[model samples]
Target: LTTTGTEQHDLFSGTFWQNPHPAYAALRAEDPVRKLALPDGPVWLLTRYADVREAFVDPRLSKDWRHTLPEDQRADMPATPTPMMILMDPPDHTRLRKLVGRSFTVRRMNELEPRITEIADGLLAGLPTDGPVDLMREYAFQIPVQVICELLGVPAEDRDDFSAWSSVLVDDSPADDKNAAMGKLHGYLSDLLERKRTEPDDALLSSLLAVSDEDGDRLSQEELVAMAMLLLIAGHETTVNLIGNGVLALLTHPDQRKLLAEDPSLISSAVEEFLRFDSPVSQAPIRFTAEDVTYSGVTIPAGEMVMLGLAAANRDADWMPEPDRLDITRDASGGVFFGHGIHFCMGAQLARLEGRVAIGRLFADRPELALAVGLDELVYRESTLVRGLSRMPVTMGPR
Candidate 1:
């Protein structure tokens, strides 16, 4: 009956991008489940933490929405079955997960810590002597992209393409433009893998091609290309938000910053809190309902697409005590932001490593490094997929 709250707070509005929680708070309170009239189609938006987490793994909701989503919005899609974990459902998803799981083990990431530190060290050492640099470009983006490039065995010199292409994927770009960018990346990956197959290197990509389970199942070339594309983009962009948003989190809450600065042991919980405090993903990709699903007595009919309001759920008061409060000491584990269930983010462990190490060093050591613009002045990207900074200017204090 009350559409006014949603009308007053359009998710796509400039104001919402500035800070979406106010609208999300309204939705979670007024209607935990509501059909949001988007430009393309009406999507059932789930704002409460419980609904969002449950919907993530609900069998009634299908992640394979390639056909279920609105016709025009399908845009460009590959002919082969999508090997991207987020887009796949059931047996196919499970298959891809196992093969990739063997390659992306926690041990690998744990061992890569010193290497991550070295990468952070090198980037910090190279910070511009000039004051007030775009921290997003200078520090946040470079670290993750470089790490991904090295891990995937892509040439670090070609990182400009990676950054540009990946940005287009996240931006409100035209379908043609997005397709071109994806093609450029896919083309590059295809060629790189071709070389790897003929002359195998010891890199992760090479290792992934050979990765197999006890059944001797292996990722096909097509699957390898798709997985690489997902890895390259998902690996960096999310962590970019993690690190960048971590800075934004610290800068806004001086009290919490002081806590972490005084004791480095808080880094682990700090990153987890960052994931919940200001989610890296504003809303995950749409999942269409396989059947009529009801939340809070609100019935959403079958074949309807649903947007999981992840950022909102992170701050849901019902789920956590003082949800709005930026508490680094709180146990923020298993937050719905990294997603839940079988399709949870594969690069989650890597994200924690990058976020903790980067934010730990950057925010903790530099007491004088402060935002060039006020919190209200900061602009988030228009893209709904990721909560990314357009630019975060910072005065790099005392070299």
Candidate 2:
């Protein structure tokens, strides 16, 4: 796609994924809301902060892909055993989310802090003192993988398989592989729920199972399985980026890194800056226009996909002062990194806890943690929806 001249760009390509901010800035300036032609179809990309924020809460944009058709017959994307609750709109979404909120509560998240810290501490213990290591695999990935799996009562021996499945589900791969990965994940969750039935534990899924069977407004079998799938995916991937991306930022900006290393109290705000500076999820899940919706005088036709630019919105200069500059002390509270309104992340609290513990502990354990490769050597993952490093080769300078 060309804005005007010979500046060609493909949003899905690795070239664009490397550093999308310039292109995002270009679009935010030239076309705040434009329906760009993509291989998937023509997608309406909203970059301006207000437009993105508005689209999130707009009731006109439905989360269900089935809403695109009059009869809900789309063969291109087959239906699952249970549609993910994140993809449902009010009534169904409201009901399912209410149940999830009861179990995935702030108090539960707080209680998990000691355990999360233990997880981080253990992972940090394995970091090589002198040799280069892929922090993404060794530290960043390990932290949340264990936390989410343990929280769901997933067996430790089985976690190796999960990271493999999750990697397939979120890559720039074909539909066949993605579908296969998802099916396996779903089947696994379904079987795990059955296992929890006979031998219940004090885990989130077990609690959900109890509620599903005993409570008046309990979730159905499909709903329970769907909830497990959402929790696993939501809880694992994003927090990996939160710590990976945050540590990368600290490594690059020595001043900010020094600030965090000096005063650990600033870690919370440091996380917000990492999110505001370069968010993990670039695009929110695709929302379909329930009806003809107009933004900035441009009309979006019904049934078309509207991609909300969360990363772009976070960096929008209009919304954030000196938006390009990264300041650990800045109050980046209002940022939409976790998103906005009703569909805002249910894993937000857990992600925050994971981020706080993971990032802080890594730096504390290895103050001399530094990137082994130059910034240019790093490759961002090839995904339009998610932004994260493929690997982070780093060296913990000393023990």
Candidate 3:
């Protein structure tokens, strides 16, 4: 199908980055698989939930780019030996996922809940209650970092720098910084691994050093360090977006805000709805086409890259009623904001627990803590893969 006026709009400004789902609905209405000419390269989009889910399980879709082409030639791919673990396919992907998976089980996360709540409360307590504050700095970003720091056995005092390192490491806003941070992260993790060698403690990093599979499946120094990086970085990236964006959404919709404040019991489903409603990371990392594939009347040649737009899929009109509106009551049925399939986020349980407690506590204390600046004037992170507010200036009523 020819590119519609909607498609033309998306092509010029990279419209989806700004607001994606409505166009996705328009595209899905006529065709689900549409070819996009991104500045980075040509990509085929899998927009619907079913197609996106199928793409996750389809053996033909490879997450590791090395299987498709040379490193230098890979279109707009990040520079690293492996573009972090989340972007790999099996059995290499399976092996890597398994090694890291043991540490992030739901039980482990559940055990950490009390501590997570404490961190949330502690941070909120220190905030200046009478004026506008940056929620990202004060709450959304710090809680997840603290949890990851505790898990990594990084000293409590050192948690202060965790945000700086994480921001540079992900470097979503500016690509230049991410490449440099990648080198820094490798060195940083290596040093942390060395520290754990002599002085191990109760944190997950220390625990990983102590525990192993029945058959002596100890993590290599490299694997140990890499797993720590994944947990620390990927653990909060989505949640940062979730909490930051979710707060912004709730502030904008006072009726829903009133609903949540009146009945704190709504938090679990509210968190789920928030994840679906404004999703943080917009696109899945690239999936390589294993063979010639045709769907929605478009043929994706073998060895091409496939990207799924989670933000778009979540808001798809056919998928969610009143797709544009934020409904805290909407049913969330295992959405892909965390991701789908074998690579589903290990830290998801921890993230949810953190969000519920963090947001829940904030409202309990100051239900009116909301946007000081108008919604339209708020700045958003630009051209970056992750979705997050740069700053949320809000004033809170007395506790």
Candidate 4:
């Protein structure tokens, strides 16, 4: 269906959810900068790659909506009791990011690679050689969760709670359900921080606790909780989809898969290609204008929400040639899948590392991997924020 700038499109519609790239292309062609009317308020979506990149670093657009929105209007906006660094702007965001960045250094990631490989191997080992196995559950979900859990020093037994809470946090769960989940996450992390203080371990959380305690400029309790929440949830959630979505893309494009399998060195480019082809994040989190901002002849007033369409921008023809096709060798460096500027995802490198090792080893181990169900039969997750399969059952060898 064609969308005009004058009409309001239901972004949550199943038709739009199933395949939004076409609709995104239509919107970008008709009006790259258009106002979308939603139940809460009007949100201006930046569809073009260049425009979204520009807005990402625009100081006039505050990440914290409370600073920009009028007091009465602010009440309408949902308040995050545990505010994450993603929602902060400037010096505050800078400090928190720096603190966490220290723990997520290149050396740390390099050290974790072998363990990641082992974890991936362990998960794949559990899959039987016969009937269909849900790759999403058995492989994609397990890898990152195991990695992050080990990195954070979360108890192995507590993983079930994390999985349950993360599912509720990312989906369209009811307000009460989300609040309860958030509260439980907060309580759990708060308690974990205390435990790590007395019984320190060689984990990211322990390092963070050390910085917060011994440093001249310490992290507040709220900041600590929020940082843990951000790292724990976002740490695995994005990678889960990346592995799931990337595998599905490769499965559908057998020629590309075969090519990558033949040349293992192309795994880096394959990861980037997967990111651009089917981005895990459909859109960046909403940013509000601290002052009036204009883009592509359209102006949005202060306090109004502006959403950068990362998936759409990744597919913009101006930025990518044959943007729809998934070519493993294609250079996808310029894509906005991980975002741009100061707010660009900090965990991007780690995510890429995970994807590279996870995808490369999976196919390497199971050369005969094939989809169990028809392409059309697979169900996509029902979330505009995150794009991925709900479940992807695949089989290896003869049934």
Candidate 5:
């Protein structure tokens, strides 16, 4: 496995996370289909818009490796119980998604709007009156976490425990530490499941417990636990990045920021633009070739790994004009920020709702909010899977 690009840059490096567009631009130009060597195995990176979209809906590329990979290869990868629906292929994935979709329906999301607004307001009110504060920690990260916890009916006392565990899930934390976090999270979720069973409430988790016992559509204890883990982590992780990155983009692009501040109605478009301009998820979860596949003049062998560069494809010059600029008014309808095909993000609507409400309220409340430090000085999370600031210190005049 090799690449024809100028250099074999480490995709997971802090520098790459800080500013990946240049490298992505280079890849899209020279090699839309390039090979990246990882410690575990070599994977092909699809960078261009067309190639990425085409590959996204291609049935030849399977998201599940359970049935596709050989025994030895499967053993090399980390283990999990029937993974979250995101990583499962048909039948299992379809069934699980159908079951969960009932709870995440559009009406449910809309009904939660009032609560989302209240959460956003509470977080904003707590912001320092006349000093710098890390909005990433203070605001961006709190909104989604609180919303997800409320939705799941997790006790208020247990909500804070997820931050440390979730942080390592998306950082360059060591494998042992990551596993430990997973173990602790899994244990806590199991206890929550038991509690929900005896004392089911109006929350999504309790609702899921009831649904799991239906006639023929039952979710086993393991599946129930896995579902809880998925909901809790995916529920908040992406949105945290969305808000942090979205606010940072607006602060840096003052013209667009002012435009949004002046027109509150643009919150919808602004959220879309934020997802496109600087996506929360940098790459789609790993996909494997079920059989030998040829894509955009590049051939990848069977059982090999493939990664769709969501952030790269979203910013492709061929897809949109002035691809580098952050224009809140840009037509972001076709952006692959939430992804494409059946495996697209399930919590996308919730994430967008939170972003629109949170970012809109933040600017509307503190019209003079500004970054407390240089953009370059801010550190980004170390994971290639997620793109977000570690801390975004911001300040504003007392309202």
Candidate 6:
């Protein structure tokens, strides 16, 4: 019932979602592999960048939790109607990823930049001037959904429902319906994909439906359903956290905020820094142990449940100097926010474009959007997998 990491330090802020950074540091310092005591069961925590990165890409690490241990131990985790790539080990992972990865190519992302900016512009325009507003609800939340919906070709009217779905599915405030919420999200996307079969649009979903490799293979109905679910959840929720957490990070770190405000041109790099500074997801979903592995003196018995601490690695002082400071000018080619290896977040460019256009332009235009509440009032989601603010209240200064 106790969180050893949380109990050890106050480093639990931003995307590390109660970053046990200090605790993680102590653990990693003492040993790269540490046994974590969870109310549900036990887990092996990997804290260093090199260790986490190698663990992330190693084909030896399977993505499925069920493959690693008996089902009873993972009862506390939510059941996914369809396991997405993040939770699948290859060749299943490779096959499904290759099928859908095409839709997220750099060229495809480049094609959406113009549209991303347009969406950010529209969302920014909708913000109330000279008044208190929930920056997350009015601005941060919409930009990602709008961009993802546009990319996925979700109908404009249906976008509102999806937004609501995001709140329920990603609610960190505490929820008793995790399974029900997942089911609801799955059913909604299932229906949407069925509709796409007959009424297609130029969104990622439609393009995916029509995609084929030189080998001329097509995704099966189940694969199509799973792929569709992946984009809807991954595309919307994570980016929502990125913008919310990014804004909160900058505002709290006044120096960083001023730096970005002075040189708006640095926003692009600043977004990367924010991802490293405070990633959205604290730990990756379950990864399987393909083969028995030994590292840091702990034995990862073959087919064990392994949690990759991307957040911990992002802030490892060994990797990022002054790991706790929010430096807008920080260089982080080594930061693993979107992840590394084959499982990297495919929507990285779009998320960056959205953050840059939204945060950069929003602040530039208003210049006085500051936190409307005390820092203590800010609420964080309890979910370890996805990190974000439940609400970020702010006020815009006079134009």
Candidate 2 stretches with Cα past 4 Å from truth are 5-10, 71-81, 170-177, 212-215
Give the per-residue lDDT of model 4 (tens digit) for 362-382.
898888899999987877876
For model 1, state the Cα shift of residue 172 in Å: 6.3
lDDT of each: 0.81, 0.81, 0.74, 0.81, 0.81, 0.75
Candidate 6 per-residue lDDT, tens place, 1-399, comes to 223543444223443344445655665565567656654466777878788988877777766665555656767664344657766666777777787777767777768878888877887788888789998778877787777777777787888877677667666544556567667767877788879989987778777888788799877677776776677677777888888888888878878888887788999898998888777877777666767887766788876677777777887877777888888887777777788888888777787887788778787888777899998677777665766787899988889
TM-score of each: 0.92, 0.92, 0.89, 0.91, 0.91, 0.88
* Pairs clashing within candidate 1: none
Each prediction's RMSD over C-alphas, in Å, is: 3.3, 2.7, 3.5, 3.0, 2.9, 4.0
Candidate 4's TM-score reads 0.91
> Which digits, one per residue and each the tens of the lDDT, describe model 1 over residues 1-399?
222543566566658888888788888888788877766778778989888898887898888676464566667764235668778878878888888888877777676788789888877777765587888877887788777777778866786677677667655548899889888989988899988888888678888888978988788887888888888777877888989888898888889988987888999999999899899898878888777888989998877889898998998888888888899999975598888887788888888998889988876556678888888888888776788797899987874
lDDT of 5: 0.81
Q: Which candidate leads the pack in TM-score?
A: 2
Cα deviation of 215, candidate 3, in Å: 3.2
So what's the TM-score on candidate 3?
0.89
* Residue 180 in model 6: lDDT: 72
TM-score of 6: 0.88
State which candidate, 4 or 5, has the greater lDDT. 4
In model 3, residue pairs whose N, Cα or C atoms come closer than 3 Å (at least 3 residues apart or on different chains), thus clashing, are none
What's the number of clashes in each of the models? 0, 0, 0, 0, 0, 5
